[PDB]
Amino acid sequence: EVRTIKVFTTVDNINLHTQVVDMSMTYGQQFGPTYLDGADVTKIKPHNSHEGKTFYVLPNDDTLRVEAFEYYHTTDPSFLGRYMSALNHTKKWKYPQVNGLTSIKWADNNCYLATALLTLQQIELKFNPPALQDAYYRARAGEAANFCALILAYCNKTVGELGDVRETMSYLFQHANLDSCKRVLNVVCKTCGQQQTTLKGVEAVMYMGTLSYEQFKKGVQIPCTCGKQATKYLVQQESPFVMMSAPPAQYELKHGTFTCASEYTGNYQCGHYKHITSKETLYCIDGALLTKSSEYKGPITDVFYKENSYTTTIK
Ligand SMILES: [Cl-]
Ligand SMILES: [Cl-]
Ligand SMILES: [Zn+2]
């Protein structure tokens, strides 16, 4: 006797594809790799309770390939398995509201994710993939599991792996609309003369080598090919924020002079991030944990500042 149930397959959890499945064959035999809200059911045979449920599958026909690209803006063939593998864990994390922002209770080396998430809620940024638009709206409301699993997938990180905040923000900015961001730099060498450069988009909002936006406006010393140090300084900025990054070093954060920052304690192989936000006072958000202080010093790695339009007075 042949028993069947109706189920729906999907790549985006919006467009559904009706299937009739044979209860005597695994999902994998019928669909390939198959997931039920992040759980791998490939090796499982259909259960009566599955009738009418939605299963994720891999994009295995042209209809699904188009739906997956339009939703996620990737064609990496391992993306949906990585997204589902992460979601099976992130759906069990907790997302407390801390000082009015969605955070993440510590689990699985997720500190870098927590500080990224907290940062996004303080800067003006809109995502391009519908998957991130939809998941980020859910995360602002407090249900951040899908957004966190998407960050893991986009960044090619698994649950439990040590991530870097700067690199994570780079990936997130790469799928955001920063097209009207522009940065003009001047590099002055006493031997070689001056060279201006213009940067756009993600490169216009990120700098690696100093935490201080004021120092970047005055000049920072960098190597020249002639062997002298040259001075690099900001000529013109058009963006709604800037991100200044450096290897971790002791640094003073002064109330009212930055938006938010990330602190890293540890070494190359293992460590822990915390988040500092400048509000009515300095709040230090460490996953679920919250403390306050009027002054702050620690091993800071990234600082975010508000911007709109800046033009140098340096001639
Ligand atoms: Cl968005
Ligand atoms: Cl600021
Ligand atoms: Zn030179």
Side-chain angles (χ1 to χ4, degrees):
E1 180 159 80
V2 183
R3 300 168 317 113
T4 72
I5 56 166
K6 179 186 73 190
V7 301
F8 303 101
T9 55
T10 197
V11 294
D12 61 20
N13 212 26
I14 299 165
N15 300 313
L16 307 180
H17 298 288
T18 312
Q19 306 294 346
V20 177
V21 293
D22 181 327
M23 300 192 88
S24 70
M25 295 162 89
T26 63
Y27 283 109
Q29 290 182 272
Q30 299 188 79
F31 298 156
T34 303
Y35 310 81
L36 179 63
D37 190 38
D40 182 348
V41 299
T42 307
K43 292 182 173 169
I44 276 174
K45 290 168 185 209
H47 304 191
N48 282 110
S49 67
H50 291 166
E51 189 151 39
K53 293 195 169 179
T54 298
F55 296 78
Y56 280 77
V57 297
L58 298 186
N60 54 236
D61 59 40
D62 293 355
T63 294
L64 293 176
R65 281 176 179 271
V66 174
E67 287 170 358
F69 179 76
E70 290 301 307
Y71 201 62
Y72 301 105
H73 296 190
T74 175
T75 55
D76 175 11
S78 63
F79 184 87
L80 278 172
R82 289 180 298 94
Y83 172 37
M84 288 294 106
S85 293
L87 181 65
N88 205 44
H89 297 278
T90 70
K91 74 187 193 190
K92 291 182 191 106
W93 291 354
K94 305 295 187 206
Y95 303 99
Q97 294 295 306
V98 180
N99 201 46
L101 299 183
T102 308
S103 196
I104 321 171
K105 177 175 189 260
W106 187 83
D108 301 311
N109 254 340
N110 73 359
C111 58
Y112 73 104
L113 296 169
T115 190
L117 174 58
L118 291 162
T119 300
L120 287 170
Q121 292 169 86
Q122 299 173 67
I123 64 177
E124 175 186 321
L125 190 79
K126 292 185 173 204
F127 291 110
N128 291 328
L132 286 171
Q133 295 174 344
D134 289 355
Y136 183 48
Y137 180 90
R138 292 182 70 193
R140 291 182 158 282
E143 287 76 44
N146 285 88
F147 187 63
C148 288
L150 285 169
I151 298 173
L152 289 159
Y154 282 113
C155 294
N156 276 84
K157 296 286 183 219
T158 59
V159 168
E161 282 194 80
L162 180 71
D164 178 85
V165 169
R166 188 218 78 87
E167 188 78 356
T168 298
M169 300 305 292
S170 178
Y171 278 100
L172 290 169
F173 294 166
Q174 176 199 125
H175 285 291
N177 178 7
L178 291 173
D179 288 357
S180 73
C181 296
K182 178 174 173 187
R183 167 169 287 169
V184 186
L185 296 180
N186 195 26
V187 176
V188 183
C189 176
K190 287 197 293 323
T191 296
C192 308
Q194 292 197 332
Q195 177 56 245
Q196 182 187 105
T197 55
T198 299
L199 300 178
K200 298 285 219 6
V202 176
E203 287 88 355
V205 303
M206 290 185 87
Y207 181 72
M208 172 82 168
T210 183
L211 300 180
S212 173
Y213 195 35
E214 290 290 341
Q215 194 59 55
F216 193 56
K217 286 170 179 179
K218 282 175 152 105
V220 302
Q221 304 298 119
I222 62 158
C224 183
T225 46
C226 73
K228 293 197 78 60
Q229 244 54 200
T231 298
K232 167 176 280 178
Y233 70 93
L234 185 60
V235 172
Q236 219 275 325
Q237 182 75 30
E238 302 282 337
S239 63
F241 67 87
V242 297
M243 179 181 181
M244 303 296 302
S245 296
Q250 291 292 318
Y251 189 83
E252 290 179 24
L253 291 174
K254 297 295 254 182
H255 179 239
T257 65
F258 70 101
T259 298
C260 63
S262 292
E263 177 197 86
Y264 183 73
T265 305
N267 62 47
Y268 64 113
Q269 304 200 91
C270 115
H272 189 83
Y273 280 101
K274 303 181 192 187
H275 179 86
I276 301 89
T277 180
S278 178
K279 301 306 281 205
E280 60 271 20
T281 192
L282 299 173
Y283 295 112
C284 181
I285 305 171
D286 181 10
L289 304 175
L290 177 63
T291 64
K292 76 176 186 169
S293 67
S294 54
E295 319 266 58
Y296 199 98
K297 188 174 189 259
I300 304 310
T301 56
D302 309 278
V303 186
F304 295 81
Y305 301 82
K306 279 249 159 37
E307 189 49 273
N308 173 207
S309 178
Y310 169 75
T311 302
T312 195
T313 65
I314 301 172
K315 292 179 303 280

